[PDB]
């Protein structure tokens, strides 16, 4: 209903990720802002425990789809904002083809005037000489289509897409994403007709940051409904 009013302007963001991949424990914090009017994120992430034991690009999808641009004619299909401020639980399994998987559970909600994404990630069965633990991923990101479907019996949504990670020899590593979102609160939420998001991202580095980190610019827009 009025969850979307919380996103009419620039909103500060905080991200906290607690991770464990093949026994390597790590913590990531992020801060920045989002403007859902334009579907734009401007963020910076730091691995606060030291060296990140996986490639930064593998963590992009885990690290706030409430900041997607939903055009006016699609406002009734924006589940993400409808669940605010109480927020939603976002759960994923990410299957890296011919390698391990991530399982994540996050809560995305307002805490004061800040939109907070707090995540737990567990990775298992990765190959020591694979693209992930072997750090063979290029430091970049592709454009994707994200497919969104209502999950009526859970009063939420299902989301599916495939992430394509460029590998340093010119090949591509697929990361198959299976996602579910459910509201935290009891209030009414919007269950959408089938549609998609289209994404753009750019990864970079802060020259003045000595810690392991990722600077992220992201543009996401919803489409597919007339």
């Amino acid at each position: 209903s009025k969850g979307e009013e919380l996103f009419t302007g620039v909103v500060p963001i905080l991200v906290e990720l607690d991770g464990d991949v093949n026994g390597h424990k790590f913590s990531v914090s992020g801060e920045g802002e989002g403007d859902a009017t334009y579907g734009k994120l401007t963020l910076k992430f730091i691995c606060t425990t030291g060296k990140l034991p996986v490639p930064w690009p593998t963590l992009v999808t885990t690290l706030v789809q409430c900041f997607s641009r939903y055009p006016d004619h699609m406002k009734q299909h924006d589940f993400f904002k409808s669940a605010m401020p109480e927020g939603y639980v976002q759960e994923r399994t990410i299957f890296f083809k011919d390698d391990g998987n991530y399982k994540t559970r996050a809560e995305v909600k307002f805490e004061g005037d800040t939109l907070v994404n707090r995540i737990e990630l567990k990775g298992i069965d990765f190959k020591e000489d694979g693209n992930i633990l072997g750090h063979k991923l290029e430091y970049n990101y592709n454009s994707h289509n994200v497919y969104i479907m209502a999950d009526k019996q859970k009063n939420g949504i299902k989301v599916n897409f495939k992430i394509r990670h460029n590998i340093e020899d010119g090949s591509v590593q697929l990361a198959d994403h299976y996602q579910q979102n459910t509201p935290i609160g009891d209030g009414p939420v919007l269950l959408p007709d089938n549609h998609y998001l289209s994404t753009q991202s750019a990864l970079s580095k802060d020259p003045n940051e000595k810690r392991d980190h990722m600077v992220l610019l992201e543009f996401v827009t919803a489409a597919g409904i007339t």
Binding site: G32, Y38, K40, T42, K44, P71, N142, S143, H144, N145, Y147, M149, Q153, F161, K162, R164, D193, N194, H195, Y196, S198, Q200, S201, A202, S204, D206, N208, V215, L217, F219, T221, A223, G224, I225, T226
Partner: protein, 298 residues
């Protein structure tokens, strides 16, 4: 430094008085925070024209880039602040500056649907053919987001004028996710689907995930589009990388009429996806018993 922070807060808050006070007290006009944002960024972004003007008079760097590669003109163009865009351009702003995705201000104006900004940028030398790092032109972004008036203007400026708002160019062009005009149109634009097919569009073009337009039409539940695609030779049993045929998708999402049309056109009821599931199986799994009955009888 301490003054620098205060100028940033004042510029962000649109506090004209305090901005002039802080300047008179020696504040650095080119102060930057820990993400490269300057007072001119904040003033331009948030529509504070008078502050933009005084900062530039005092020597603010008009093309300062923040961590995400953004200049004040990027932010003004996105926000639709026309007068500020003009002022920035009049004070040496690079009209074709790039953010880290490779967006020019013209990309961003087209993205955000600001027609008057688009025209202004073109007037000041914006590169109408600029591509971002995903190959998108400003025209492409306009077409994508349904900003048809802007698409017309951009196509004319690119020298292929007339009829841009209703799409344009090669019917078999594809972008980096492998989408052709037909993939875009499959999402409920029936008359456009028809036009494209009559104009030679490849009905079975598969995108980067293996989806044909028929997959997308089945997913979005558009019966007449499913019908016209089949009429013009759509592969009724095309499988994506997950092994889904269009009949699988229709069975999942409860599209009975589409199920019937697919069967009529030779859909395979025994096709298994990657998890060994048939359309009947998925119909059961998703609570669509009526479709399950039709599928079994078939």
């Amino acid at each position: 430094s301490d003054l620098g922070k205060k100028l940033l807060e004042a510029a962000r808050a649109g506090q004209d008085d305090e901005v002039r006070i802080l300047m008179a007290n020696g504040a650095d006009v080119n102060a930057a925070d820990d993400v490269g944002v300057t007072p001119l960024h904040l003033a331009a972004q948030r529509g504070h024209l008078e502050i933009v003007e005084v900062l530039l008079k005092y020597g603010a760097d008009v093309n300062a880039a923040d961590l995400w590669g953004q200049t004040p003109l990027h932010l003004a163009a996105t926000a639709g602040h026309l007068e500020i865009v003009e002022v920035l351009l009049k004070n040496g702003a690079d009209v074709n500056a790039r953010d880290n995705i490779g967006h020019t201000p013209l990309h961003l104006a087209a993205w955000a649907g600001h027609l008057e900004i688009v025209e202004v940028l073109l007037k000041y030398g914006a590169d109408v053919n600029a591509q971002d790092k995903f190959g998108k032109t400003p025209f492409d972004l306009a077409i994508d987001n349904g900003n048809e008036d802007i698409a017309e203007v951009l196509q004319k400026a690119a020298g292929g004028g007339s009829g841009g708002g209703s799409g344009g160019g090669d019917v078999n062009a594809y972008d980096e996710v492998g989408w052709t005009p037909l993939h875009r149109a499959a999402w409920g634009h029936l008359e456009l689907v028809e036009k494209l097919l009559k104009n030679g569009a490849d009905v079975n073009a598969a995108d980067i995930d293996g989806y044909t337009p028929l997959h997308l039409a089945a997913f979005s539940g558009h019966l007449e589009i499913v019908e016209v695609l089949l009429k013009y030779g759509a592969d009724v049993n095309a499988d994506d990388q997950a092994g889904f045929t269009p009949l699988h998708l229709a069975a999942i999402f409860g599209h009975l009429e589409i199920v019937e049309v697919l069967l009529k056109n030779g859909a395979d009821v025994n096709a298994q996806d990657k998890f060994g599931k048939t359309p009947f199986d998925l119909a059961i799994d998703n609570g669509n018993e009526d479709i399950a009955e039709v599928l079994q009888k078939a």
